[PDB]
Design a protein around this ligand. Structure first.
Ligand SMILES: Nc1ncnc2c1ncn2[C@@H]1O[C@H](COP(=O)(O)OP(=O)(O)OP(=O)(O)OP(=O)(O)OP(=O)(O)OC[C@H]2O[C@@H](n3cnc4c(N)ncnc43)[C@H](O)[C@@H]2O)[C@@H](O)[C@H]1O
Length: 190
């Protein structure tokens, strides 16, 4: 059970991740969560990562690969690879491990829906979609920062999708649905 979740900021990676972990019971290696853990603990990694994360940019491939390579030593990779260079590195790591990627799952959502999804997010919950009975909000979910995140991720998305689409491991799922309907489709694949 070796799975990769990729998707644009706010597509529903982490949302589906929790459901995948609860259903199947596997490790969940989320670069985003790892950086947030590292940032909060003020480790050297966290410090140098913070500048890029707060800017909305991607942290360099070297350090991102470093952190993942060690941490892999079934699984659910979340937000990795999100560049080709990262994916190129993963292929070697996995061959070095003796475990191949069974499925790469792209959660497809539309750049318009993402702005609303990220701004309305409360941590997950959402103000209009998954509302709490009664009423924190992420630092990088600011309108201005979200725009930078979408810009930067879309650019790296195409080369990846094409990469994995050629490999014949890519599987698109319709992300623009109810949470459980999105998960059902994942179930079908998994
Ligand atoms: N490999 C890498 N290389 C370089 N840098 C890296 C890296 N990996 C991480 N980073 C760094 O990490 C930073 C942040 O990355 P990261 O923390 O991974 O965030 P992201 O990739 O930008 O995506 P988000 O986490 O914002 O959205 P999500 O996909 O988790 O969706 P969510 O479940 O919240 O759900 C979205 C919202 O919508 C709602 N929602 C969920 N599902 C549905 C549905 N089906 N219908 C309607 N609404 C829904 C939810 O309630 C929720 O509020 C990056 O800026 C970068 O700095």
């Amino acid at each position: 059970m070796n799975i990769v979740l990729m998707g644009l900021p706010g597509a529903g990676k982490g949302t589906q991740a929790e459901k995948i972990v609860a259903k199947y019971g596997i490790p969940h290696i989320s670069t985003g969560d790892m950086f947030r853990a590292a940032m909060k603990e003020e480790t050297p990694l966290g410090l140098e990562a913070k500048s890029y994360i707060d800017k909305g940019e991607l942290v360099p491939d070297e350090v991102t690969i470093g952190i993942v390579r060690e941490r892999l030593s079934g699984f659910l990779l979340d937000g990795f690879p999100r560049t080709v260079a990262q994916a190129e590195a993963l292929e070697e790591i996995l061959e070095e491990m003796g475990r191949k990627l069974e499925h790469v799952i792209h959660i497809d959502v539309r750049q318009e829906e993402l702005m609303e999804r990220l701004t309305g997010r409360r941590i997950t919950y959402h103000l209009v979609f998954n509302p709490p009975k009664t009423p924190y909000q992420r630092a990088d979910d600011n309108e201005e920062t979200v725009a930078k995140r979408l810009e930067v991720n879309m650019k790296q998305m195409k080369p990846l999708l094409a990469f994995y689409d050629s490999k014949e491991v890519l599987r698109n799922v319709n992300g623009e649905q109810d949470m459980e309907k999105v998960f059902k489709d994942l179930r079908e694949l998994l």
